[PDB]
Amino acid sequence: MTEYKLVVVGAVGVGKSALTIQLIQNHFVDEYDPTIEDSYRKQVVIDGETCLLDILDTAGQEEYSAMRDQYMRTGEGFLCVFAINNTKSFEDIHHYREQIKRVKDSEDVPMVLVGNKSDLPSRTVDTKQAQDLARSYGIPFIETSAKTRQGVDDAFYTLVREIRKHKE
Numbered sequence: 598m599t600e601y602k603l604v605v606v607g608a609v610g611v612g613k614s615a616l617t618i619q620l621i622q623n624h625f626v627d628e629y630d631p632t633i634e635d636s637y638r639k640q641v642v643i644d645g646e647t648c649l650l651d652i653l654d655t656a657g658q659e660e661y662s663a664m665r666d667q668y669m670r671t672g673e674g675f676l677c678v679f680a681i682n683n684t685k686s687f688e689d690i691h692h693y694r695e696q697i698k699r700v701k702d703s704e705d706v707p708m709v710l711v712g713n714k715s716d717l718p719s720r721t722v723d724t725k726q727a728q729d730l731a732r733s734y735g736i737p738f739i740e741t742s743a744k745t746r747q748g749v750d751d752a753f754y755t756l757v758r759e760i761r762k763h764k765e
């Protein structure tokens with residue numbers, strides 16, 4: 598059984614825990630819980646391949662940065678989810694960019710940049726900015742939301758494919 602080691606990156610307000618639980622047990626939690634250390638091991642039949650998807654929900658802060666480097670070198674796939682509710686989440690991408698680039702010891706690595714909470718009326722971050730930026734690195738941008746739950750599964754299924762392509 599293929600055991601994929603992935604980690605999610607973001608900040609407080611994104612709601613990465615609400616996105617994970619929605620795909621772990623198909624449930625949407627409204628309450629925001631401060632996640633510090635949570636690992637999700639769920640079996641997914643990706644294109645017919647029943648594999649295990651281990652997802653570690655990291656804190657949306659910079660308090661455990663010394664511990665970040667630990668799984669940052671172990672995780673192959675980086676789930677980058679930014680909220681269009683804040684333009685800062687679109688700026689912090691540069692921080693993680695140079696951060697991952699260093700710890701990964703490579704300029705390339707299977708990463709996906711997706712937007713969350715697009716169903717919110719506060720569209721501070723427009724799709725053109727996201728698409729153009731995504732096109733700079735050549736990464737697929739997927740509009741997602743656990744509130745409306747549209748194309749969420751697609752993002753996960755195609756994500757694994759990128760990991761496969763980075764190997765074979």
Ligand SMILES: O=C(O)/C=C/c1c[nH]c2ccccc12
Nearest residue numbers: 602603636651653668671672
């Ligand atoms: O060290 C532990 O006890 C757990 C580590 C991890 C659990 N899920 C992960 C996903 C990517 C990288 C590391 C992990």
